[PDB]
């Protein structure tokens, strides 16, 4: 923090005495079920060595957790979102560069407990016949407890370059009706992967034995809303003051299949089965200070 | 804090009534997979005995966690980042000096529990005949519990001088599928180092038995984003008002090998096998208040 | 706090409508490995009965955790920082005085749990022979738990005077690979002081059986960064408007020796074996409002 | 808070549109080891029915935890601060009055646990010899847990009047190498008061079996820094616009003795053995709005 | 909150563009040991439908925990504060009214834990004489835990009217040397009420077997500092612009007695034995905007 | 929050550049024991489509917990507040409307722990006669605990309309001397409802076996202070600029009865035995911007 280095808070921040131009650009991809919104801000601070553009990618990518396949009452398939992504890419010719972005990857932590306990105890017996009993015992034990927080989905900043940046919101694990947590690799000898299995050996049809979307992570169905910021800089002396940039919203889906084993339900998950990719190109005019698509 | 010594908050900070000049310089080193960004700020506060330059080293070093070695079905190696580093250095013929930096090393703490428990307990018996049972016991107990937090990586400020300063974000330890945690020295007689081992005796190719990056620290794969601040002071009277400074982003990688031993998997970790070093020289002009590369 | 006594917050603080003069002074002691930085601020608030100078002592003293001795693979010694110190001192004839300082010693606390638990229980036994029976017991138990946080190092304000003030950041205790915590007095008959012992029976050179510095408190190696403040007051009527003041950064190292008895590893620690002291005189000029060295 | 009663925050606070006069006064009592500082502030708010003086007593009273005597290697004494005090008092005649002060006595709390547990259990047995045993038992348990925080020292506001006010920072209890806590009355039949006892059977000299100050509350040794505030009000029409006020800084020391019985060490603590009192008279001039000593 | 109803914060508060008149009035009652202070504020905001007076009652009522009776060496009584009260009252003829007050009563809460546990287990044994047996057991548990915070004293707003309001800070319960808590009704057939009993068998005289006040809630001895606010509104058209008001500081003391039975100590507490009442008449002048006594 | 939708904080709030008129209206209902205070604010913001009036209902409704009948030493009746209510209502012909209100009903949460535990243990026996016994056993456990906070009273927003709004603060449950919690339906075959039962076997007059109010929720006796806000909107073009509004403050009492069976005390509670309703009519004049009663 600036105060950590004895400098008035905000002194090195950009944007004072500058007229900022902002804009909203909304696009809805019906086919891919994606509400894509770009919120931008041009900050041409004359005391900063370069022009600046802040591109915030928001909107919402529908989860689309649903039963798509049905072949009899013994088998059924559920397509679900295992990953959500947003990426911005400047073509190689562009002199403009990706300079910063938020959020980024943070360091996770964990709690660790080490426990040592000593135990000494006595004892004395006695019966209605005159016999006197007794006992002496010792005991020791070491224990360890590991504790940590596990989000249903992880928000990750993908290694960026000066031309492209991206984020992927990936399914981590999830609690199934107090059971689990389960993940894309969970495997039980009897039931396989119970990730979205409603009952282990219920009587109903397969297509009706998938977890209630309302009982699973809301991102799986209703969707995920990106809230990412990308900072792009541009030399003021650059000969060409226009820049193209592609923005891609994507959804990776897994395949969760159920099938009656004759005595119980067994689950199977196939990773990255389908990939819904919606791309769009925008035009950045550093002179008019507007962005169009 | 200022209020702690009866002085109006901020009274002592540098920067007020000063026109600050800022700049951004981006550099992508593809072979080393490093998005290196310098955010600078020149503060020439006339009420401060020296000129200040605040250099912020950001951007992000890719993790690059990958199975690069595959020597048959029983052998495979994984390269991973055991350390990320950023260092700034002023040559010896410079009158400019390193004055402050952030973050710095913090004093870690731990929680401790001391427990003493003791009690007594009666007892009486009797069978369908006439015998009477009776017991009397005592028991003492002593237990101690140590509880502390462990981040996946530790952020450390390396001993600085007035010419050089640096930080290293080193791998600490990590939880492997609700187990461990493990570190670079974890050693088990049967499985060796299980740090990134996915299964202990599963039957798949070696190169397919490494832990999914999505299940390990995101820094290992997607990467770490430095956010370090360095402040450099310069005398307004020094003969030469130009300073060179070299900035180095570095990634030290370890080698995690896995090999099948007739009946199970075993792992070994080789420390600091590789070191990806990306260096760049910057020119600092205190009169123009510009920084360039 | 001001609010607690019905006064507008900040009403009694010093520094308003005053032009504050500040400065940075950096000195690097190569022999002692100390980056010493003074950040001062002159506050001559005319509505205050005296001139005021705030001296912030910062920079960082390197830890210097290193194996220095090694007499055969069975003997080796390690030097570590048990204490870091920073002191300011006005020569006795100075009319200027030390008036305040920060941080100060805070009152430590602890959590105490006292538990009383009792209960009754019954029982009924039988056998295919047709026998009947029953057991009746009762129990009581009293237990208590003590909980408190222990920093690896304690930051202490030494008893000051109107001519000298100082701080010592002393090693308290530390966790050794999930065990401990250990301290300078930890003693085990079999292994002695295991503070920095890597393994108990390990079969390696003694110079290789010391704990990895990354697995220990970062202040031990990379170092500690002081951030203390000292306020000095001065009478405006004082005849000599110049004041000398010496600042001393200090490091105290202990000696942790490891030797192989014949069956296992044993450790010993020698207190305050070495003392690195780096002193420096500064001149305070209350008329020019500048500090020089 | 003002907002709780629908009034603009800070509307009723004193001090606005007022020129406040502050001052600092430092005195060092060499014999008593007391750095005494008084930071004052005159607030003559014309919209207030009275002139105000806020006196903040700060500085530091050294702990002085010291081994003072030793007659035989089996007997020794340690002096320690069981209490620190700061008191202000206006002479009888004075028309000025003690109006407010901070801190004050807060209401302590405790956490309480009530737990009831019901249970039943069965147990069917037998043996290779055809036998078949049975078992049916029940149990009930009632237990409570008290949980509270306990500072090493308590800060108490002594019953004030309109002429005097004072604070005492008294020793409460302390953890001794993870045992206890102990206090001035602790008593073990064998060891006596183990308050500052380093070892129970140690064979060193008595003056070498006292707890190291680094492992005990820093107030005991390095000292305590008062930070108390007193508000004095004065009528503008009082015919005598000058006021004297006396201030006492005090340390009360206990006597902790260790003597070797013949088999082990035994501790004894005698209360209030010594008292170090430092008194000063300050002169308050409400017309010149300055305080002197 | 104002934001909860989409209104700019502070929009409805009173006090803007208004000159507020404040005052301090101090009274010390020697006989009753009560420092009494009124801090008033007249807010005649012309955009408010009435004149307002905020009266804050502070100061401090001494605890006065004292051994007042000593009938021989086996009987002694201790007077302690079971309640502190502060009340304000407008004579019923006054047209001025009590409008608000703070603090008020808050709704307490408690935490509730419900636990169900079930488990199975096997057990196979064998002896040198070839005998081989087995065992199977099943069990269930149902636990309930109640957790809640217990302040040593409760701060309560007494049912107000438009002419009188008061607060009472009443003794709730207290811990005695890690035991209890105990309260005015605690009773043990052996030792009676152990609230302030130092020892159960101590061979000292009665007067010397009372709990050390330093080891009891500091409000019992040093005292309680009231910090209550009362808002009084007044019609601007009222013919009589002056109002009288009485303020009462009060202390209710209980009588805790200890007597030696012959084998142990037994204590008993008598409620509301004594009542110290300190009343004072103040004059409120709404035109001159001043309070006097 | 505005920031969530990229809008300058406070941008959409109402109140700026508007002269707000406020007022206080106090009424004390003697017979009903209710201090009723209304604090209103007219906000006619010309950039808002309607005039606004914020009405805040405050003051306090006495609890009035009291023994109302003693028909014998074996029978007594206790009256206590099971619910507090405040309701506002616009007569059906009013064009003005109820637009907002605070507080509202919030979603309650609970914590759930699900735990699984399994383990093994051996046991080797042996006696002097030469016998050598052994034992091996397994064990599994499934336990889960529910954890949630329970306030003594619930604050509920009754289903509002454009003409009426109201709140009811209702008794939920309460801890009775560390046991329970008990509620209006608690029942024990032996004791009935122990909600306010002081002792189970005690031999005193019935009217003397009710819980001490100081040991129960303060709302039961001293009372509850409403702090509700309701905003009314009005069209500036509405033909009649005068509005009537009726306000109800109310207390619902339950009848708690204790009778002596002959061997112990048994408690009974009858719901909504009494209702104390206090109603007032206020006149709102939107042109004069004043409220009166």
From Swiss-Prot, chains A, B, C, D, E, F:
Keywords: Cytolysis, Hemolysis, Secreted, Signal, Toxin, Virulence. Self-assembles to first form a non-lytic oligomeric intermediate, and then, a mushroom-shaped homoheptamer structure of 100 Angstroms in length and up to 100 Angstroms in diameter. Interacts with human ADAM10; this interaction is required for toxin pore formation, disruption of focal adhesions, and hly-mediated cytotoxicity. Alpha-toxin binds to the membrane of eukaryotic cells (particularly red blood cells, RBC) forming pores, resulting in hemolysis, with the release of low-molecular weight molecules leading to eventual osmotic RBC lysis. Human RBCs bind much less alpha-toxin than do rabbit RBCs. Heptamer oligomerization and pore formation is required for lytic activity. One of its GO terms (biological process) is cytolysis in another organism. Changing residue 259 to I/P/R/S: Nearly wild-type oligomerization, hemolysis and target cell binding. GO terms for cellular component: extracellular region. One of its GO terms (molecular function) is identical protein binding. Belongs to the aerolysin family. The lineage of its organism: Bacteria, Bacillati, Bacillota, Bacilli, Bacillales. It is found in: Secreted. This is Alpha-hemolysin. The mushroom-shaped heptamer is composed of a cap domain (comprising 7 beta sandwiches and the amino latches of each protomer), 7 rim regions whose protruding strands may interact with the membrane bilayer, and the stem domain (52 Angstroms in length, 26 Angstroms in diameter) which forms the transmembrane pore. Pfam families: Leukocidin. Changing residue 35 to I/L/P/R/S/T: No oligomerization nor hemolytic activity, wild-type target cell-binding. The keyword Zinc does not apply. Its main location: secreted.
């Amino acid at each position: 923090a600036d105060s950590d280095i004895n400098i008035k808070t905000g002194t090195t921040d950009i944007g004072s005495n500058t007229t900022v131009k902002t804009g909203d650009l909304v696009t809805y991809d019906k086919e891919n079920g994606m509400h894509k919104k770009v919120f931008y801000s041009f900050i041409d601070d004359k005391n900063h060595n370069k022009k600046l553009l802040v591109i915030r990618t928001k909107g919402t990518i529908a989860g689309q957790y649903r039963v798509y396949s049905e072949e009899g009452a013994n088998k059924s398939g559920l397509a679900w979102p295992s990953a959500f992504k947003v990426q911005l890419q400047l073509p190689d010719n562009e002199v403009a560069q990706i300079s910063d972005y938020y959020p980024r990857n943070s360091i996770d932590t964990k709690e660790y407990f080490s426990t040592l306990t000593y135990g000494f105890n006595g004892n004395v017996t006695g019966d209605d016949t005159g016999k006197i009993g007794g006992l002496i015992g010792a005991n020791v034990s070491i224990g360890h407890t590991l504790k940590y927080v596990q989000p249903d989905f992880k928000t990750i900043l993908e290694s960026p370059t000066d031309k492209k940046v991206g984020w992927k919101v990936i399914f981590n694990n999830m609690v199934n009706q107090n059971w689990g947590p389960y993940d894309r690799d969970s495997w039980n000898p009897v039931y396989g992967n119970q990730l979205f299995m409603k009952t282990r050996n219920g009587s109903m049809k397969a297509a009706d034995n998938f977890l209630d979307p309302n009982k699973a992570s809301s991102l799986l169905s209703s969707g995920f809303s990106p809230d990412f910021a990308t900072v792009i800089t541009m030399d003021r002396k650059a000969s060409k003051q226009q820049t193209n940039i592609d923005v891609i919203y994507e959804r990776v889906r897994d395949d969760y299949q159920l099938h009656w084993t004759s005595t119980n339900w067994k689950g199977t998950n196939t990773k990255d089965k389908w990939t819904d990719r919606s791309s769009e190109r925008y035009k950045i005019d550093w002179e008019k200070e507007e962005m169009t698509n």
